[PDB]
Design a protein around this nucleic acid. Sequence first.
RNA 1: UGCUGUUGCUGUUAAAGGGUUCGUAGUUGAACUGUGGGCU
RNA 2: UGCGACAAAUGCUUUCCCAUCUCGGUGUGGGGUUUA
Lengths: 143, 85, 199, 129, 76
Amino acid sequence: MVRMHGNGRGKASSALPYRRTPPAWLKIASRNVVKMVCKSSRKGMMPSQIGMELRDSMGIAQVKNVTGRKILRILKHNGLAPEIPEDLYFLVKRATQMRKHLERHTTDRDTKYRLILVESRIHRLARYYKRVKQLPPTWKYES
Amino acid sequence: TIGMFNEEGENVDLYIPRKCHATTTLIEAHDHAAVQISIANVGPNGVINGTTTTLCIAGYLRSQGESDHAINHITIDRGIMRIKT
Amino acid sequence: QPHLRKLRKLKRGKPSDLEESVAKALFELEASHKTLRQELPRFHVNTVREVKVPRSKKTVLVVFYPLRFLMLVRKVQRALTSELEKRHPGCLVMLVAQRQITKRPTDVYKLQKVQRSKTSTAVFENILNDMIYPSDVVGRRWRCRTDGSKLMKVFLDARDRKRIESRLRAVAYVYKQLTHRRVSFGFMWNPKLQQVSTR
Amino acid sequence: TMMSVLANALRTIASAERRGKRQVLIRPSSKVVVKFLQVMQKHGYIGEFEIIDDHRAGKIVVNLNGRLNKCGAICPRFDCATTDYEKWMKNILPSRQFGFVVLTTSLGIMDHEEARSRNTGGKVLGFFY
Amino acid sequence: GFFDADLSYPTVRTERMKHKRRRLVQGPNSYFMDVSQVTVVYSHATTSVECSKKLCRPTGGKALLVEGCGYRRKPD
RNA sequence: UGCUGUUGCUGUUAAAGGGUUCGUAGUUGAACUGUGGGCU
RNA sequence: UGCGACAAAUGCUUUCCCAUCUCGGUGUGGGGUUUA
Ligand SMILES: [Mg+2]
Ligand SMILES: [Mg+2]
Ligand SMILES: [Mg+2]
Ligand SMILES: [Mg+2]
Ligand SMILES: [Mg+2]
């Protein structure tokens, strides 16, 4: 979004605290936190969205600091991880919508240029996931 | 103690240039902007006792305009100048 | 006698004079205290060791327990610590979990398989957290002097200066007896902006 | 991107000394960088320094006396046998009376004068004088 | 002036003005509040928070609290 | 002859940065598992 | 199959839903800790 494929140089991001201990006023047991994570997944939420629900309305700043494990690790233990990784899923969805737009507007050359960048990003990402065996070999992206 | 000595024990240096108190650089023979300032020591009654303290400031520090700032720090370290109120 | 059940099965034979005294206190508390009565039944200690801090009056009692009960002890550490002090006047008690360390390998392939929680860096950090548990570390610095020495300083929150100030001399000495490393302490008001407090 | 942490740190120190600053901040830190500073500290070229922990690659604040003229890294880290010491002294040092070349050897990190006494070679890291 | 600035112990005036990732040690900017049933609300919430009605409105920065319910900042 | 430049050249105007991006071989690539201790 | 003894880096005197009904110790007369 910033550096690869473009000239952006933005710095906006979050900064985790030095003190990794949950506050005293938080009185939720670790078992119940794990239950809420798995419940939201069956409802259809992605790991990024799950962590924001707990942050916004439950007082849980970091799931790892309460339970000892990350959100995606919890889903893998319960057999709830997505078939393909989340960031690869969103990039494929974006490219599909670009291609559907382009089949009517054949002269939108700016969109055609952006489609080249997104598909290069997909192929780089797929190569990494195949090396660490998060994707099957011979997985291929089809335009 | 300061300078270059041969193995015979004699000092073989022409002279020892001044070393600045603020910049710790050597002051060369053709600086012409380096200065020395003498501040009198005043006795408890409120008059001078006949002794002064001397400071040296390299020329380039006076070109950047930082010579005034260096003087402030030095005087405090010597107890000549107070701070706060 | 029932109170010996609070010890490890190895030491139930010939307990030392310090071991059974703690055992009696733990057994008595397990049936009297309101909050300890549902955690204590599953708990038992390994051994108790006595340390004499030089240039001081109070002595330090160190209690070792298996790492299984880490979460059990952390839940009731405040009440358990204060309760034991009353039974043993003129002494200070610290609860330390017994951990093992795997020595650092020389071969690259072996180094990749080390369990990170068994490294000396991780173990010594957790031992320090045990001795000050109600408080936590808010900063840490290393001071490298010109003579070549390196001194480590740990900063605590100033909000709980009153509670833990008296114990810092004992904690520093005991930490050296268990790890053979030097530590020093300081306080920070507003640790977010790294502001240290002088008195 | 940043390829060498050691090269980045030494350039920061030399620049601060040239401008006459009293302290300088260094980031990111590394265990190789700390060893290099201790060698300079032992011979009296820098003052006291301090390491700050932040659960990441830390930071270092070092106090400078006015004695340092220049420090720098050598890239790539060439190999140096015991017979090559005179060659490197002749090329990157101001004189044969002062200055040091820092090496990494199987005995640790040390200056070239100590390495010669121990009769060991290694790889060149940098220099200072 | 007249005060020497130590890099490792900056003054509160200087350090307070810095960007959160430009401090000597980086840290968060947000916090938690409780409102009044009683619920905990993140200071920079972007999703919808329900009691029975919505309690905050998302914004480019801090969330906007509705009028007619008391709030209090939680410690730590 | 530092006018072939690894040591060790030049590229705003003297000769010389490709019209702009994507990209495979290739070259290059962030931190971390480590202060031994006691005696005269 | 039974038996004796000891560990365990993570609590089976577990979890889960199925239901059915003021004193003492501590630091300087006051402070802070557990408890009442
Ligand atoms: Mg020649
Ligand atoms: Mg030429
Ligand atoms: Mg031209
Ligand atoms: Mg151009
Ligand atoms: Mg590296």
